[PDB]
């Protein structure tokens, strides 16, 4: 796959295997806190004993192979001696700790891109991001195909990169690393239909030896011009409501007709009729047949304590 695959992926692969190894070792209890004659050492694993563990699991055939594999990890920095570093791995009862255990944790730009890509792949594997599907572009069907335009939308929606420009730039870095490659010609990431394939897959790691807010209660959809026509469905009525210490207790939430949204059953309005299924066209004399509900809400508050209101009062139709 060229220099890009041979270098970056190999670095990625050893890190993925090292992480797989660390999780396995913790389950096997190889890495455990130790105290040497009242001198503690947390999250430690003895170098000499580890070789035996590797032989049992068949990762390393003999002492040579185990040392070589661990030396490769040391040349990367995935592990470090708890005390002053001994550099090349040695078959001695000595305490070592992983970099990812925060002992040193040397970060780099490649690692951050790799780690983010790995985390994204877990999201892509999960149902949460189901963009991965078999799809055909340029006459060829490939698995794990997700449109580049769809991916950019998903990043903003998911919140991994809220800014589209930042999201698109991040993919270019991954494309340079090779984490994501366009299916056919490795075309650089663009907000287009361009189908992409994930070259790096976290699963099946390598082996050591191989290294609705609003509410609407009005049934009538629209009454504009339905009311204006004289007679027929409704009979007009005028309601005069007196102010109260606790307020009138009614809400109007009709865009054009300004229908009454709700009425307080214990309030003065409910005592003087004022049922929920009503429409208003004039308040305190002024005709408000065609205005917004909020504008009417401004007028009723700015008006006097006693409000003159006209209710359409549909007759059960």
């Amino acid at each position: 796959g060229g220099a890009q695959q041979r270098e970056l992926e190999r670095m990625a692969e050893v890190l993925v295997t090292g992480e797989q190894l660390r999780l396995r070792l913790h389950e096997e209890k190889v890495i455990k806190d130790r105290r040497h004659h009242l001198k503690t050492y947390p999250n430690c694993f003895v170098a000499k004993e580890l070789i035996d563990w590797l032989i049992e699991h068949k990762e390393a055939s003999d002492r040579e192979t185990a040392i070589k594999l661990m030396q490769k990890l040391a040349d990367r920095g995935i592990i470090h001696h708890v005390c002053d570093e001994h550099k090349e791995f040695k078959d001695v009862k000595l305490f070592y700790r992983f970099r990812k255990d925060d002992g040193t944790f040397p970060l780099d730009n490649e690692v951050k891109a790799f780690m983010r890509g790995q985390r994204l792949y877990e999201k892509l594997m999960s149902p949460e991001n189901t963009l991965l599907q078999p799809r055909e572009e340029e006459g060829v069907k490939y698995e794990r195909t997700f449109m580049a335009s769809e991916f950019l939308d998903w990043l903003v929606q998911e919140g991994e990169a809220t800014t589209r420009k930042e999201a698109e730039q991040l993919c270019h870095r991954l494309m340079e690393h090779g984490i994501i490659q366009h299916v056919s010609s490795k075309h650089p990431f663009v907000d287009s239909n361009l189908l992409y394939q994930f070259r790096m897959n976290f699963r099946r790691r390598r082996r050591l030896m191989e290294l609705c807010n609003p509410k609407s209660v009005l049934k009538r959809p629209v009454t504009s011009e339905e009311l204006l026509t004289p007679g027929a469905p409704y009979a007009r009525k005028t309601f005069t409501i007196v102010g109260d210490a606790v307020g009138w207790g009614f809400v109007v939430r009709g865009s054009k007709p300004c229908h009454i949204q709700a009425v307080d059953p214990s309030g003065p309005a409910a005592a003087a009729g004022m049922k929920v299924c009503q429409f208003v066209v004039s308040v305190n004399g002024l005709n408000v047949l065609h205005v917004d509900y909020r504008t009417v809400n401004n007028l009723i508050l700015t008006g006097p304590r006693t409000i003159v209101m006209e209710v359409m009062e549909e007759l059960e139709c």
């Binding site: 004659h37 009242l38 001198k39 503690t40 050492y41 947390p42 708890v82 005390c83 002053d84 990812k100 255990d101 925060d102 002992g103 944790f105 970060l107 951050k112 780690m115 983010r116 985390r119 919140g159 991994e160 990169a161 809220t162 609705c212 807010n213 609003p214 509410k215 209660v217 210490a245 606790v246 307020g247 207790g249 009614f250 809400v251 939430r253 949204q261 709700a262 009425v263 307080d264 059953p265 214990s266 309030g267 508050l301």
Partner: protein, 651 residues
């Protein structure tokens, strides 16, 4: 006494006539005063040899419990309800037992009742309402979720789960459940919904929805009047707001009076309602008087710290002030709030709070470093992140943060910003301290960490001299290093040149320790026991060296003489230390303890003065000879009294 005298004479037939009449009085036309008289009679009869009066079987364990409950004699209720429990355990009994404990302000006892239910009855018998009473909102939600999945949706189980959501504060999920179910609901549950639905809308800041819900709340409810008054202040209806608040206070009459009658603790709930009411009065001024604003903030800050540290109460209070004060305009309020959420074990809400203050999501921007703007906020996030078991990130951020801080300090240090510069040093100091404690938890104790964590604590000490924790932590670090190196010699040398090198090495770490402990003693000024004992351990072991003695001499002068009274026993134990330079300074120290507060010294000294071994009694007498000159009367009195008491003690 009259009753017992009579009740003994009666030949059982008259006792039944009496007991039947007692039943009628309790059962029918019960009067509080008569009841508590007859309850005190039943308790008095329990203490009597005759035994409790047998009424309608079981000694009226059910009736007297019901009667004590109406009398609000919750201790009598508990005792009687426990007698019934002893005969048999029932779910009904457990429920009443729980409610009794909550009324009695004994939360721990009620929690134990739930543990009994878990073991002996399992899970089905535990209703979700039981968690609700115990304020186990996390476990109540699990119960209401399990119940509402299997059983068909019911008004009661819906309100129960919604009530839990508002206590947790999950306003997102609570507002979705509201919008979904309005027409599906009856008008009775509708009125029980809006009080919780409005809270959710208010939390999200959607004022149109909030107006719809508040109208559905009954006016008669005290809470409903307050909610209406809130939509007044949103619409700037100041005149109507004051009217609504007054009616709200009027409705709180009944609640405040009833709770105040039986202990202050029950009245606390009502007290919080008036707290929020009078704060709403101080929002009208805040919206009218720009000149009064900074006073209001100081008042608000001082008031909230007097209030109790319960997270529910704070959320209520903060929501009120948030009507006219965005969280950015007052950071310290919401940070202290987040800390309570952290301490109470609800870091999810704490996290949301901190994200809202930060501005962005740090977790999403893993590669990006934490924002520097508002550093006090950032620091709170890191120490939260540590509690969230993301230490690897937190530690790395702290290293980056201090580099930014120290660069932001250097470049921005002008003569003008001196308060800013001083605050930055105080922050960095708290950062440096976290580094050390974290490094030990992450790395461990070994040859490489100790020089590093010392570098950090040293910087912390520089940036905040007066701060107690910076000196104590630095001192304790140095002392541990001295012990660790000594053990290394024992492990390798015991099991010529190395001890002479160790002399320079330990003295390199010993002189810092002495200076630090003496400064950390003065700073604590009343909590220096640990520090003072550590001084003694160091003094006795290594003080025979000239350099360690020198530091101690200046320290013993500097330190106050009241501190040494704590450790008078430990001093006299080593009165005869073979090392001369130690013993000579002990005498000089005891001398000054003698000259002021001799009553603290005479008793242990008199015991040493008559010790069998010569060196102890010789030293003790030499000190007493000097003590005598000041008073002499005490020495003669105590020497006689003690000799006579010994004679008395063993003939």
């Amino acid at each position: 006494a009259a009753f017992v005298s009579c009740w003994s004479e009666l030949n059982e037939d008259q006792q039944d006539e009496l007991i039947r009449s007692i039943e009628l009085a309790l059962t029918s036309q019960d009067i509080a005063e008569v009841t508590q008289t007859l309850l005190n009679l039943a308790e008095f009869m329990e203490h009597s040899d005759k035994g409790p009066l047998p009424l309608r079987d079981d000694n009226g364990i059910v009736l007297l419990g019901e009667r004590a409950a109406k009398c609000r004699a919750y201790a009598k209720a508990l005792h009687y309800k426990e007698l019934e429990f002893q005969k048999g355990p029932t779910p009904a009994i457990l429920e009443s037992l729980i409610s009794i404990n909550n009324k009695l302000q004994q939360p721990e006892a009620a929690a134990g009742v739930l543990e009994y239910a878990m073991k002996h009855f399992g899970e089905l018998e535990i209703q979700a309402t039981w968690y609700e009473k115990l304020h186990e909102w996390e476990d109540a939600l699990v119960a209401y979720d399990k119940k509402m999945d299997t059983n068909k949706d019911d008004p009661e189980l819906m309100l129960g789960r919604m009530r839990c959501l508002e206590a947790l504060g999950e306003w997102g999920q609570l507002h979705q459940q509201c919008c979904e179910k309005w027409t599906l609901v009856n008008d009775e549950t509708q009125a029980k919904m809006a009080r919780m639905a409005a809270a959710a809308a208010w939390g999200l800041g959607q004022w149109d929805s909030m107006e719809e819900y508040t109208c559905m709340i009954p006016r008669d409810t005290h809470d409903g009047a307050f909610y209406r008054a809130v939509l007044a202040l949103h619409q700037d209806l100041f005149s109507l707001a004051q009217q609504c608040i007054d009616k709200a206070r009027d409705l709180l009459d009944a609640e405040l009076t009833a709770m105040a009658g039986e202990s202050y603790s029950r009245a606390y709930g009502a007290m919080v309602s008036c707290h929020m009411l009078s704060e709403l009065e101080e929002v009208i001024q805040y919206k009218l008087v720009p000149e009064r604003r900074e006073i209001i903030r100081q008042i608000w800050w001082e008031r909230l710290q007097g209030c109790q540290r319960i997270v529910e109460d704070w959320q209520k209070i903060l929501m009120v002030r948030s009507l006219v004060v965005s969280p950015h305009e007052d950071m310290r309020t919401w940070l202290k709030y987040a800390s309570l959420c952290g301490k109470s074990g609800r870091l999810a809400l704490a996290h949301k709070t901190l994200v809202l203050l930060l501005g962005v999501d740090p977790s999403r921007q893993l590669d990006h470093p934490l924002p520097t703007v508002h550093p006090q906020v950032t620091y709170a996030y890191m120490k939260n992140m540590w509690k969230s078991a993301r230490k690897i990130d937190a530690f790395q951020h702290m290293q980056h943060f201090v580099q930014t801080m120290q660069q932001q300090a250097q470049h921005a240090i002008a003569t003008e910003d001196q308060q800013h510069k001083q605050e930055l040093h105080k922050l960095m100091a708290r950062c440096f301290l976290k580094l050390g404690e974290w490094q030990l938890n992450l790395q461990g104790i070994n040859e490489s960490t100790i020089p590093k964590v010392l570098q950090y604590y040293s910087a912390a000490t520089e940036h905040d001299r007066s701060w107690y924790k910076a000196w104590h932590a630095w001192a304790v670090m140095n002392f541990e290093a001295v012990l660790h190196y000594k053990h290394q010699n024992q492990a390798r040398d015991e099991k010529k040149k190395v001890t002479e090198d160790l002399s320079k090495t330990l003295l390199m770490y010993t002189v810092p320790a002495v200076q630090g402990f003496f400064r950390s003693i003065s700073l604590s000024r009343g909590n220096n026991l640990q520090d003072t004992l550590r001084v003694l351990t160091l003094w006795f072991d290594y003080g025979h060296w000239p350099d360690v003695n020198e530091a101690l001499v200046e320290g013993v002068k500097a330190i106050q003489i009241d501190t040494w009274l704590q450790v008078i026993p430990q001093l006299i134990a080593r009165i005869d230390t073979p090392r001369p330079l130690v013993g000579r300074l002990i005498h000089q120290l005891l001398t000054d303890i003698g000259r002021y507060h001799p009553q603290a010294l005479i008793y242990p000294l008199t015991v040493a003065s008559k010790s069998t071994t010569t060196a102890r009694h010789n030293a003790a007498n030499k000190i007493l000879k000097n003590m005598c000159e000041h008073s002499n009367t005490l020495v003669q009195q105590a020497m006689m009294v003690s000799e006579e008491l010994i004679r008395v003690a063993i003939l």
